[PDB]
Design a protein around this nucleic acid. Structure first.
Length: 51
RNA sequence: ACGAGAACGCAGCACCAGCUGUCCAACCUGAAGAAGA
């Protein structure tokens, strides 16, 4: 018989699963002073470029 | 000066009426977006 089991996972360390790779900053912004990286809303990015 | 002369085997008539090319059936099975030193 089939028995379901709800599973909870707590990452003790950092866990990374990839979905894509990007080179130096083209699809994101990196403020080196504040150690903060911003990902640009790409459709709003192209609307802004058109504007 | 023919057992012969003259004489449409012709007229009207729907190969037509009823009937599902239908019934059953997962595009499915397995696979770490991942690793040197």
């Amino acid at each position: 018989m089939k028995k379901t089991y709800r599973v909870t996972l707590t990452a003790l360390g950092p866990i990374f699963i990839g979905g894509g790779e990007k080179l130096k900053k083209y699809e994101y912004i990196f403020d080196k002073q504040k150690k903060v990286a911003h990902m640009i809303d790409h459709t709003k990015f192209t609307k802004y470029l058109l504007e």
